[PDB]
């Protein structure tokens, strides 16, 4: 065995563990989610596991979807000098075209044999795994300050008397047993002798700190396009209440969509409809209020 504990400022190591674990957790959660936002009229007719596509797109490798046996299996694809042949690395096994491939972008609208590359972002300047590191430390220390604020927001009622058995019988039989009408000696024995340590310099501070945590989440959120935007259009709470500057959050949402524009180039080739929409739906009540067809009653209940 080996044991000799520090003190009870162990909490001052537990506090910094909460901050450190919050940064690690929020960082890898936020990129645990971020490669699924778009999902684009999900599997109309096309054999793509779009989850495996979007995970590949957020490590910035240019995937290439084409035909394999007329059914659109993904492949990897790493002034205008045109690409034609299957020179690139190919991830499937025997489903390779073994024939004339092409990029279907500008050779014509809708004619050439399909192997179209899809960028994550049309013009690439900085990776957004750096921006997610940029705010999560700032977010980490505001989560530190919230946790440190509510950890010292606890309150005792200090009794103050010369020690051995004068005031103990008082609080036992007449405060925590709830008793009104306790009788005492005239020796100033509650003339502000019992005192309260309060932290009312802490609870007005508490709510404003939560609002700073909240709008910093929102200021990370609208950067990476994930937004509450369309419902904010129909709710009429459009500007300076949701302090987000709508023209910037509809801006950063749009760059990721027109990065995945070459799926429309593919969609024009084989005669089908694939639009890169932007997912904001969460179900069992939204699907109920949009239909209210009695077959949807036998589906849910």
């Amino acid at each position: 065995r080996g044991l000799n504990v520090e003190l009870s400022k162990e909490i001052s190591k537990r506090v910094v563990e909460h901050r450190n674990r919050f940064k690690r957790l929020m960082f890898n959660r936020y990129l645990e989610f971020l490669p699924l936002l778009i999902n684009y009229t999900n599997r109309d007719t096309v054999g793509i596991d779009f989850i495996q596509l979007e995970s590949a797109l957020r490590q910035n490798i240019n995937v290439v979807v084409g035909e394999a046996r007329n059914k659109q299996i993904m492949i990897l694809g790493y002034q205008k000098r045109l690409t034609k042949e299957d020179i690139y690395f190919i991830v499937p096994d025997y489903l390779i075209p073994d024939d004339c491939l092409q990029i279907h972008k500008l050779y014509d609208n809708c004619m050439s044999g399909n192997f179209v590359v899809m960028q994550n972002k049309p013009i690439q300047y900085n990776s957004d795994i750096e921006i997610i590191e940029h705010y999560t430390d700032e977010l980490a220390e505001v989560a530190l300050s919230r946790f440190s604020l509510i950890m010292q927001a606890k309150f005792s009622k200090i009794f103050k008397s010369e020690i051995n058995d004068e005031s103990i019988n008082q609080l036992v039989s007449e405060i925590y047993n709830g008793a009104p009408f306790v009788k005492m000696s005239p020796m100033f024995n509650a003339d502000d002798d019992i005192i309260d340590l309060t932290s009312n310099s802490v609870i007005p501070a508490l709510t404003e700190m939560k609002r700073e945590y909240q709008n910093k989440i929102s200021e990370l959120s609208n950067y990476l396009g994930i937004n509450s935007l369309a419902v904010d259009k129909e709710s009429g709470v459009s500007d300076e209440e949701a302090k987000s500057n709508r023209g910037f959050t509809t801006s950063n949402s749009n760059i990721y969509l027109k990065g995945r524009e070459p799926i429309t180039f593919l969609s024009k080739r084989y005669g089908l409809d694939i639009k890169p929409y932007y997912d904001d739906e969460t179900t069992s009540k939204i699907s109920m209020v949009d239909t209210l067809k009695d077959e949807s009653s036998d589906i849910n209940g």
């Binding site: 034609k84 004339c100 050779y107 014509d108 004619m111 050439s112 044999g113 005669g271």
Partner: peptide
Amino acid sequence: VVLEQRIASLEQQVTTFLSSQMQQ
């Protein structure tokens, strides 16, 4: 209608094979 598409597909196939050995 169907031919219009296959005729378009084969012309691009000829054009992307002529440029592999073209003077252009």
